[model samples]
Target: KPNYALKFTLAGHTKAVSSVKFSPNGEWLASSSADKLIKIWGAYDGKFEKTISGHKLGISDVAWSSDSNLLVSASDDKTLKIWDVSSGKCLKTLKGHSNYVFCCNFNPQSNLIVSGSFDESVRIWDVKTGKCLKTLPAHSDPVSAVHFNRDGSLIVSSSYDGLCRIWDTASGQCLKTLIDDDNPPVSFVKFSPNGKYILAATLDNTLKLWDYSKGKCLKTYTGHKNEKYCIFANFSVTGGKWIVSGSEDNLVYIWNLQTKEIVQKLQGHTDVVISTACHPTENIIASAALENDKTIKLWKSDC
Candidate 1:
């Protein structure tokens, strides 16, 4: 029988899946994979829509334009490619990174993009000309992830150098450096939808929520394994009251925002759960696993 609260098990990728995202309007789901392809599907029904392929190597990340008319993908091929989702065609390939291009995302209002690279830099690109506008020497080591705030005025980046840095999007200036003496390499970074917090995954096997304005750690979420692959987390879209993340232990962990307690541990995947996504407008959540577990599963509240 289907899990009473578990919604659907989406299958498309033949290899390990790297990332999954719901389109901004909540109409579609986009997933990237080591299979070197990006698949689109109906967000609610798990219906496969189309497959996008152009990268020569595994794709690492995928993001959608606000209008959902376009998408961008980063890959181990050391390039970022923009796609027209409607036609399922590669529109442009933004190349400059000398190494794996892992972290990438589009701004909230426009198609402008920001990406972090294993090349140890953070780059901003203009949508109008499809040109690289600025590159900041972001870290001492490879930048693993980069995310823009809701307004596109700032960017937060995570690095293997054991630091996360805040940047002014316009001038490419480093505004603040977030770090701890323990200095564990950070794997992923994301800005809260409400724009009040910056969440990061650290090699310390935990997640840290930051108050970017104050440059302080608001809370640390533990009990979930993240010591391996670039596993990630997200805030519940409805009320932002819960944090959802995956574990190398093949479990999904949900945390109460205010209490910082492990409210739930969802189990199903047989391999590591490396990426997770919270539905843009509901209590629904989705997860993807690494290695042999190529399925993307969605879950609903038991209540």
Candidate 2:
């Protein structure tokens, strides 16, 4: 039998946690919250180590560099801050977004960072110089999520316009646009571990899988709740066998990616479960909730 249980709650955020990210090395966890703070915790023991605060407004997303020595945070303050984790100092502040910067990510090389903003643009920056290398004027509406493939050769971005666009990292040309008006307004999108597929979370309350190479919709996973915030979902790090997603219904849903069967429905949060993330090297998972909850729950299973 498969066992699943709550491990612990990392309580410190005074407001809603908009995003949670586990480091690539799987030793640390970073959370971005509406309270205008970014918290770093020990992934295994859940010990609060440091709090990074410099944003004048609420932070929306956080990511770690490949070396795990640097962290990037996006904020409603319209800037992204790069932090040196060891020193807990703001190394560089990237500015340009005319509106809220919703998401930020570092490429595999850690030489570049990509960010999506509500201003309908995706900006790529040079990590060393903190200069905007290129700006891809993307999306008709808010660009909620952006990520680079395993090799950082391509970038995938999703928007409220209900389109998932694949762009050439070098030329700033859009390679492909995947859209289904039936599921208008995609909240977020991510590349699969193998970089062959893409998963998109939509306001239609469903997760759509697409073949990035062929630009084809492969399948849709249902029975999860999504709202205005663009409920985030991710594949397990153990391999891409399981899909985990947050629900506005105050639950976190896990499903078998191949069978599309509900593997488990985790319940604990008092308000809407806004985001969830599977650890990069463990069976453990983390989830964030809406306003009244103001907390993040860590989960694991012991047989």
Candidate 3:
């Protein structure tokens, strides 16, 4: 196991930080907040770079393009905005959803974006034209998370309705529906880096690794409190041998991917830790907490 410890505690967003992500090139870190701002920082040094402000309401999530030059943010303002990272300018605003936009992600090719909204829908957009290409009536309740597969051929979305659905990106067709017997509302979901499995976080205080194609739960990791907020979970950088997640208990939990053992618990935040992001090219992780904390903390391994 690697000795992971806190490296930096970043405080800037006046309101709760909703999400954080590292650029694909590992050069920048972006964080979105209920303060209605998206801030960029130096990935390795934790230096504040710039602030992006345009959304009329709180920003819920942010994602970086595969090439690392662009960023997209979902907002409670009922739209997603694409930005040019270098210039700190909004390139486009995609509107159509009737409710708050909760999550957004860019495909590996960088030409497309998938977003989930409180309107119970998932939308795919064209990056260049800023037009909606397809909208899937994704769930019975608000959609909490959305992500594209490694090759950008498929998308996975999780909902407050207790289901995770895999979609054929090109056809906009539902390919699979993954659900647990208890039917706990899913807070977040992500396709494994290899694209063969899914890692999902439910309000039941557990994170499960799913064999998506077969609709089977392979492993369950527990030890964190997660019954209220929409917490985020993701695979560690590099090997995909570890998993990390934020907890309502105000701690960051990391587990061995295969054994499901709680290998590390990162502590600092004074409130619910709602979002987490792993650096794309290093053993560094970034976690953001809710209102009381209002900070983003970076962790790095000493291996």
Candidate 4:
């Protein structure tokens, strides 16, 4: 039996909520929306904390620093903004990408940020100086996701061009490229918590776990609707024994990691569940929905 249950349905955003992320410290939950606003909430109680507004266009994604004091947001406004979480003030606006900035992430050190853009490029930025450190022509199509390894020495990027590339962060060189046999467009990618594997979410309705060092596919998770949008997926907070993902089917799917069996399916949203965040310290999940839903749902597990 599944122990997960819906705990809260948070409502405030007037448009689609693009992304939701829990702070690394697990104190706060931040949500970004197409309404050009980012809202902060209490992680445990789902209390609205503050509204962060400054972007001229829809925000696509938001990421928290390792300390959970700063946040970086990617927007259609063609820039990334770093905000002081406690003050709700924009501290820096990083400019360089010529098109919409789709995704952004803070490195483990919290001193560097990697961003993917509609311009088909991936750029590394200095968090302190707010400067573009390096630019890589990452893919043939728009870059959808970017993430750094546990040590922040390696970066992996996924693209609509049907490829996931691993790069050396220090040297800014391409080290390896990963692609499936069917060549489906990869919408999201992340390094495993142990830094030994890669998780790639492709539009073919599958999530693949890759042993990057050996260049082999270790597992594939299915049973979710994800043929159209770029939905987000993540490993479970406790021991990484399960995989959780948002779906175009308007559901949250949790799978047993090794067995690839669908263990739980959370149903609530009337539209696509675009993004999900697993709590860093607890078995809690925050999922954000599209325009039709415009809500964030929180789930907690008893076991």
List of clashing residue pairs for candidate 4:
none
lDDT of 1 by residue, 1-303 (tens): 112156788888999999999898989989999999999988888888999989999988999899988998899999999999989878888988899999799988775899888899988987666789998999989888988888999889999999999899888999999866688989988998867789989977888888988888889889987776788788875744787888999998988887888878898998999899977786678899987889999887632
Q: Which residue pairs of candidate 1 clash? A: none
Per-residue lDDT over 37-153 for candidate 4, one digit per residue giving the tens place of the 0 to 100 score: 999999999999999999999999999999999999999999999999899889999999999999999999989999999999999999999999999989999998999999999
Better of 2 and 3 by lDDT: 3
Q: Model 3, 73-139: lDDT tens per residue?
A: 9999999999998898899999999999999999999899999999999999999999999999999
Q: What is the lDDT of residue 239 in candidate 4?
A: 41
- Report the Cα lDDT for candidate 4: 0.93
User: Can you tell me which runs of candidate 4 are displaced by over 4 Å?
Assistant: none
Model 1, position 295: C-alpha lDDT score: 96
The CA lDDT of each predicted structure is 0.86, 0.89, 0.92, 0.93
Model 2 Cα lDDT, one tens digit per residue, 85-121: 9798998999998999999899899899999999999
Ranking by TM-score: 4, 3, 2, 1
Quality of model 2 by C-alpha lDDT: 0.89
Scanning candidate 2 in windows of ten residues, the lowest lDDT window is 1-10
Candidate 3: residue pairs that collide: none
- Give me candidate 4's TM-score against the actual structure: 0.98
RMSD of each: 2.2, 1.3, 1.0, 0.9
